[PDB]
Paper text:
The G protein-coupled receptor GPR139 is involved in neuromodulation, and one of its agonists is in clinical trials for the treatment of cognitive impairment and negative symptoms of schizophrenia. GPR139 activation triggers several G protein pathways of which Gq/11 is the primary. Furthermore, the more physiologically relevant intermediate states of GPCR–G protein complex structures in the nucleotide-bound forms are also elusive. Here, we report the cryo-electron microscopy (cryo-EM) structures of GPR139 in complex with a key reference ligand JNJ-63533054 which is an analog of agent TAK-04110 in clinical trial, and miniGs/q or Gi in nucleotide-free form, as well as the GPR139–JNJ-63533054–miniGs/q complex in GDP- and GTP-bound states, respectively. To improve the expression and homogeneity of GPR139, a Xylanase fusion protein was fused at the N-terminus; the C-terminal residues 322–353 were truncated, and a S622×39V mutation was also introduced (superscript denotes generic residue numbers).
The agonist JNJ-63533054 binds in the prototypical ligand pocket in the bundle of seven transmembrane helices in both the GPR139–miniGs/q and GPR139–Gi structures. Interestingly, in the GPR139–Gi structure, two binding poses of JNJ-63533054 are identified based on the EM map. ‘Pose-1’ is similar to that in the GPR139–miniGs/q structure, while ‘Pose-2’ has a flipped amide bond linking the chlorophenyl ring and N1 of JNJ-63533054, and is associated with a changed direction of the chloride and carbonyl oxygen. Concordantly, our MD simulations show similar flexibility of the JNJ-63533054 binding mode. For pose-2, the ligand’s N2 forms a hydrogen bond to E1083×32. In addition, W170ECL2 adopts two conformations, whereof ‘conf-1’ is similar to that in the GPR139–miniGs/q structure and in ‘conf-2’ the sidechain swings away from the ligand-binding pocket. Interestingly, the MD simulations show the correlation between the binding poses of JNJ-63533054 with the conformations of W170ECL2. In addition, the interaction between W166ECL2 and JNJ-63533054 is dependent on the ligand conformation as well. In the case of pose-1, JNJ-63533054’s N2 forms a hydrogen bond with residue N2717×38 and N1 has weak repulsion with NE1 of residue W166ECL2. For pose-2, carbonyl oxygen O1 forms a hydrogen bond with NE1 of residue W166ECL2. Additionally, JNJ-63533054 exhibits different binding poses which are correlated to the coupling of different G protein subtypes or states, such as Gs/q, Gi, GTP- or GDP-bound Gs/q.
Numbering used by the authors:
A (entry chain A): 3 to 54, 182 to 232, 240 to 354
B (entry chain C): 7 to 63
C (entry chain R): 23 to 304
D (entry chain S): 2 to 121, 124 to 235
E (entry chain B): 3 to 340
The structure:
Amino acid sequence: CTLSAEDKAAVERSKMIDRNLREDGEKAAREVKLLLLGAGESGKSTIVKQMKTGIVETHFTFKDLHFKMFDVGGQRSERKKWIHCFEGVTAIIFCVALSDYDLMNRMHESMKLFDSICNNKWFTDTSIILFLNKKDLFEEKIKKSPLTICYPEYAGSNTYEEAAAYIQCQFEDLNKRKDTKEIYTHFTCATDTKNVQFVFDAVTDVIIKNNLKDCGLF
Amino acid sequence: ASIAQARKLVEQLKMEANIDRIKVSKAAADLMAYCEAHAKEDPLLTPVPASENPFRE
Amino acid sequence: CGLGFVPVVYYSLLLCLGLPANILTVIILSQLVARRQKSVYNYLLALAAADILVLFFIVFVDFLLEDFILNMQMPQVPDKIIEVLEFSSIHTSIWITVPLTIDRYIAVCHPLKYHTVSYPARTRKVIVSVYITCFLTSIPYYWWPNIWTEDYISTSVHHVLIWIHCFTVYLVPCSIFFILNSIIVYKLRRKSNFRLRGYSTGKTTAILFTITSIFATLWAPRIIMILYHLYGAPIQNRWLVHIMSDIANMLALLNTAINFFLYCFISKRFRTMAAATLKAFF
Amino acid sequence: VQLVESGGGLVQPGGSRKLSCSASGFAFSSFGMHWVRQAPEKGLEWVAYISSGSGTIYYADTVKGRFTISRDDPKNTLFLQMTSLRSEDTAMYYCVRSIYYYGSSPFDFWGQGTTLTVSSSDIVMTQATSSVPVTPGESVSISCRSSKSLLHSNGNTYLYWFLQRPGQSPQLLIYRMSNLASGVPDRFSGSGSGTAFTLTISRLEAEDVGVYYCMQHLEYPLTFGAGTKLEL
Amino acid sequence: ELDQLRQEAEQLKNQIRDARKACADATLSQITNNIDPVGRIQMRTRRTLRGHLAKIYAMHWGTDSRLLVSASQDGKLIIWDSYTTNKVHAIPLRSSWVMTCAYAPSGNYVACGGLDNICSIYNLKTREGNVRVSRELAGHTGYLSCCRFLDDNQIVTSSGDTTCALWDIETGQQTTTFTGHTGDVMSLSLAPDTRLFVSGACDASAKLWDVREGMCRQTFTGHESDINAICFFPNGNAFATGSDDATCRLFDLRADQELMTYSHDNIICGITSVSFSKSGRLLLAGYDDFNCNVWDALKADRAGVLAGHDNRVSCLGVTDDGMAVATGSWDSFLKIWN
Ligand SMILES: C[C@H](NC(=O)CNC(=O)c1cccc(Cl)c1)c1ccccc1
């Protein structure tokens, strides 16, 4: 031993702290972290109101799974210095206002930020749960406002069923690494309680892939 | 607003320019005279014997 | 007999292929970043240690010293002790894969409960329990059946012991391997198909099939001849017994040689970690 | 941060009871608790111990086997089950919390204690003459020796100092050679060398009056000393 | 007029550059000729503090040169004992996203902060046993880059916005607010006299402030990219920085210049930490190439390299007695070199 009584007791207390730290780390290992990103408009808050400072957290459990959501749209700083602390996040949630094109344009800003997040050197293996909200409003203003106002290469008809698919594929054509990660898309709306289930299914898929990579099956 | 911030910048620049400076030769002499005067007291520079090192065991 | 130089060279190549590989696996996986992050790393460390014990105790002791190098060991204490220890080694090697495939099944079929049911703290208990149980269960092998020394009558204690060994090494493990791997393939192909992944599903199916089939095929003859010895016939040509039993044992131990590749060399994460450890280590 | 002891009474010889103290106002789950007892008119004596998490239980020689100590974190109460009570277990038992880390102050807060009535290899620490005549406003140097050198290899002498005002519980004064507890004035300052120890009071008022004790924490039995009573 | 004001600003900047150039006789490299080299520095990993489970982002030493504080991306903030590897405390954080940690000179308090824009100050020594949040310092818009304790009552902070702040504990308000920067302001370093302090920003410009008068005395330029770390010379008349330009520079307050540049062609990754040794002859710089460095102060020559960390070194500091240097990294370990 070659230790004194208080030294031994301090070592015992340190071992207890080790046990508590390991238990807390195990607790956090069961928790799914979901970073939240958005366009210039604060659609993240609007959508999360339906599900019910700087970084804000929204803890909720769905079908026996603790969820973490990190809305960092209020940082108002340079994203480079703090985007590196967010690697290891299970999936990145990104919202695009489908009706926000007839306004560099705002979908182009959204594409810029999407490119900077998907192609960032930190998020090579991190999936992105893309959300294309305001679907009714986009279907509403699609006829009056041609898509050439933001898509000079778009020559299809100004009808919703194709005008949404073109945007979805255009976003899907920004990840230069289509193998290390995958992009999930859901044309959400202001009236949809199924978005939680979409996120749940995507998270189950991501954790399945992570388990396969851990076990070597992938 | 822009006029005010430009005025603030020019006033700060004026205050900085009104300073008294010293020659870099003298500055470097002072800096190198601090290490020599404190050389023997550096555990990292001259390796400390293991008896006096509190990290031997 | 000019065939005597075959087993020695085969087991020499066996050791050369296995001991460096498994010792490197142990060195890489013994780090704290491995034992605490993923349970698969702990299970693979246990599998590598069990494989090292298998290689040493069986190959280097028996098939080299007791068959080619020394071959006059006093029979009572040390030969039977070596038999017990090597049966412990094979039991540990085969029953560390069982928790490994159970962990894989949980992680692929119920991913939500994977971190709740399986974690390094529990896998430590499982590994130590498996080692202790195998060490205790291998004591009945002290009175292991003797065939090569003389053809004589095998009594009841040999029958039950050989049945227990056959079950606990080949039959129950292969059955659970088959069930778990078939169900994980079925639950990886059918239920979700959300991303329509072809490459990952094909690679996983190929790996699982090349695990199950290779284990069954390599452990077939070593059990088939025991079954034929017991229930088949008293057929003569004791020499043929030595020949094909030796080849069956070589196949069975080639299995535990290639488990290294088939379990940890496939993992791209393990390969990257191996490169990183060799770099910083070297 | 009151830590009230409950239990005690007129127990028959050879009987048994349980002593419980309810911590109210600190991290009981992290504080390691000590049991000490004081004869009706004599000095103190260590009894038991439970570390944080109840993972280390150490006993005195007299109470070994006889006494079983227990800890209850959720109720913030510490127990002491006593079996086969002899005629010498009568005392006013005291509950002592103690937290052990670098820079800590073990044996800091002492409970009010409860009374007990039973009807009809160690470090010897001694205090000189057991009595000192003092007057207010002067200075007094209380000294107490030991049997073994308290200076461990890690450099800190494992000595303590306690004050028992009449009809009160002991306090913590000097929680190592040349230390000072929280809440005690700058007047108290004791420093020693190896086996010899001293404590000096700069200008004693009527408040710092009573019997003083010094105990060792190097070898774990924690032998106390006699009392150096101060009085006019 | 905007045009006239900008022309005046440009010509004053040119005048300042001319004054700086006119007061340069001989460079530091030329002055430090015929001086013997430090030589190889064979530091060895005496202690490895393997308790964390996430990236070590910040570290700070106690004045006793024995107690450490480490902050990681998990909600934990461990206080270690450097001599005997132990854990004095495990402080749970209300926000796991932390970027800084500060150990008070008296040892009574520990401060931390991150993306929450809050400089949470904790009370280590309380009448109870647990560590509790003393004050939650609010008033910053951007993330908290670094904090340093002036005393038990005061603390300065480097925020995410172009603003540093001098807070006063016991009343959440900030006394003097320093607003002269552009872009994010990264770590700062107080002076021993506790009257001035240098700050590093992403505008590739460091500034020496006066904590009493609240103004900026003089500014230092030369870097080509964001300054990620800054350390202050023990004398008080110099300081050195670290940038993503894969270089470090030593400035002098009474000369206002850059004295000589710590740049090797073999390095491309930036610097995350910088710490002068005692007497300021060895400068430790933590680089992103999973590695550290030991840079001689008065000569550009490079001493040994501290290759012990698997991931990026995000934090390192020297003790007050200069007896050991502990370096943290993005792998949860935190080694102590001597
Ligand atoms: C550990 C075990 N060890 C043994 O099986 C040793 N016993 C025999 O080889 C044996 C015994 C009785 C009859 C016959 Cl045909 C052969 C073993 C298992 C597989 C491969 C190699 C070694």
